[PDB]
Design a protein around this ligand. Structure first.
Ligand code: HEM
Ligand code: HEM
Ligand SMILES: CC(=O)N[C@@H]1[C@@H](O)[C@H](O)[C@@H](CO)O[C@H]1O
Ligand SMILES: *[C@@H]1O[C@H](CO)[C@@H](O)[C@H](O)[C@H]1NC(C)=O
Ligand SMILES: *[C@@H]1O[C@H](CO)[C@@H](O)[C@H](O)[C@H]1NC(C)=O
Ligand SMILES: *[C@@H]1O[C@H](CO)[C@@H](O)[C@H](O)[C@H]1NC(C)=O
Ligand SMILES: C=C(C)[C@H]1CC=C(C)CC1
Ligand SMILES: [Mg+2]
Ligand SMILES: [Mg+2]
Lengths: 240, 240
């Protein structure tokens, strides 16, 4: 916010709604979004992402409104709703399992290994490592998931999510496209803003113009190719 | 509510935002939605469709949230925003032209001819006529628009829209899947509820269970086939 000291991290309780997005889960665990994770509107996401991370409305409105499709309510979601497969949620996640063969909702340390072990011999993750992780995660899904979906759209969302962890959890300039491993690991493993570790909210606005070239570079380095249908169709609502 | 006396039709003025949907335009021209056609949220569409037409929240939430994707705002649209090609707006409209060869926004009497001349020798449009119109409209697009998009999704939306005019503008039971031509023609040509002509809001709720078999029947009778890749992908936001 202005005031991070008024936004302590608290572990979610068993009935606090959490989803497959560490970004939104983290905001909830700090009360930038409701701690119960319910009745969350796009305006609330925009405000929360601005205050918590300095992520601007352009990307939060675009993603937010697509996320709204995952609930049965007119204008809000539960965070857990976002797990709806094929709206935003996708195979070859960084920290979750593919829904056809596992839990697509909760953090999974065994999946996270790949990201956790990336960019050996640095204390940062950095675009080339992000690209290698994506390549490796997708290969894992192609090897082990008979229902794998991999399209231009999923590939692009995947690169966006990598650009998010690199920029939002950065030490200095999110432009640099690298983040301390100690910040990113806390972000994923605990869904906590690593304040005591030394993280501060970006003073640079994180918007689509800033993210665009980072996303494209990750995609390009990931040596990604179409594998199948390549139809970028999203699921438009629950229980269809 | 049921106070239609408080909801007179007024022609839209020059600043009043209108879109490619007669259903929503008509609600605005009666002040069930803002007459200016701006800052329209899904809750407002739900309320407006209920009061004006007895259309229930199931379909209005589903379609409403997809419609929200067409603006740059967090949780509202302008009615004209709904013209964004490839979100909901589609080729082979009943009353508008394909965007690649014409105006996909405004009512067009020459296009509407096909619908207007359908079901010869009855004073109602019905499911078989609705199906023949769709077939003929699509054939026209395939003949004259080399960029035609025709998919399972567009076919479904098209059949939904036909089910809408048949049900919302019905004389008695929307279940019957037929509407007086004098009601439907006023609906399209003037974006007015034909109260003068004798129309009343349905006393039967119009919801997905009621529309579902009508939609399926229209599709079945329309001798439909997909075009090209048959990719049901929607455009996710403006100016991507
Ligand atoms: C704006 C609204 C947002 C929505 C609706 C949203 C939704 C989602 C969804 C549904 C996923 C699951 C994708 C998957 O891995 O299968 C996801 C993943 C992710 N989100 Fe968000 N998100 C939003 C904002 C943010 C923000 C502000 C950040 C900031 C860091 C962020 C970071 C991430 C990351 C890193 C993942 C990757 C998860 C993984 O691969 O294990 N998101 N998001
Ligand atoms: C409330 C009852 C509704 C009725 C009776 C209705 C009726 C119709 C009809 C009959 C058409 C076909 C026009 C044509 O083909 O020329 C149409 C088109 C359209 N409607 Fe609706 N509609 C309703 C609600 C909605 C909602 C909630 C949305 C989105 C939020 C929406 C968005 C559209 C769009 C984008 C089109 C353009 C499709 C095209 O022809 O390319 N409508 N509507
Ligand atoms: C900056 C960048 O995109 N990639 C770098 C890579 O060149 C370097 O070898 C590695 C270890 O420092 O860290 C990452
Ligand atoms: C997953 O793939 C198998 C074929 O290998 C298929 O039978 C099954 O229906 C798929 N599951 C889903 C969720 O579509
Ligand atoms: C529609 O009306 C025509 C003309 O009366 C009729 O021949 C046709 O069977 C009707 N189709 C229906 C009821 O589906
Ligand atoms: C679709 O329209 C674009 C407009 O630039 C054109 O390049 C493309 O050839 C068209 N596809 C056809 C004609 O099938
Ligand atoms: C650039 C595109 C297609 C966007 C689609 C939706 C999300 C979540 C961000 C990227
Ligand atoms: Mg996933
Ligand atoms: Mg159209």
């Amino acid at each position: 916010a202005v005031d991070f000291s008024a936004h302590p991290w608290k572990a979610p309780g068993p009935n606090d709604s959490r989803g497959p997005c560490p970004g939104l889960n983290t905001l909830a665990n700090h009360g930038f979004l409701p701690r119960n994770g319910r009745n969350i509107s796009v305006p609330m996401i925009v405000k929360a992402g601005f205050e918590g991370y300095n992520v601007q409305s352009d990307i939060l409105i675009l993603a937010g409104k697509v996320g709204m499709l995952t609930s049965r309510e007119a204008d809000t979601i539960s965070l857990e709703d976002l797990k709806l497969h094929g709206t935003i949620e996708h195979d070859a996640s960084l920290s979750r399992e593919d829904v056809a063969i596992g839990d697509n909702l909760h953090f999974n340390e065994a999946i996270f290994t790949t990201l956790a072990n990336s960019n050996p011999g640095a204390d940062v993750y950095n675009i080339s490592s992000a690209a290698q992780v994506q390549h490796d995660r997708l290969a894992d899904s192609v090897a082990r998931n008979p229902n794998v979906t991999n399209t231009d759209l999923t590939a692009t969302i995947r690169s966006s999510e990598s650009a998010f962890y690199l920029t939002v959890m950065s030490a200095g300039d999110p432009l640099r496209g690298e983040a301390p491993k100690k910040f990113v690991n806390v972000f994923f493993q605990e869904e906590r803003m690593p304040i005591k570790e030394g993280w501060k909210r970006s003073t640079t606005p994180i918007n689509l113009p800033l993210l665009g070239p980072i996303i494209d570079r990750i995609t390009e380095l990931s040596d990604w190719k179409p594998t199948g249908d390549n139809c970028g169709a999203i699921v438009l609502g629950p229980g269809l």
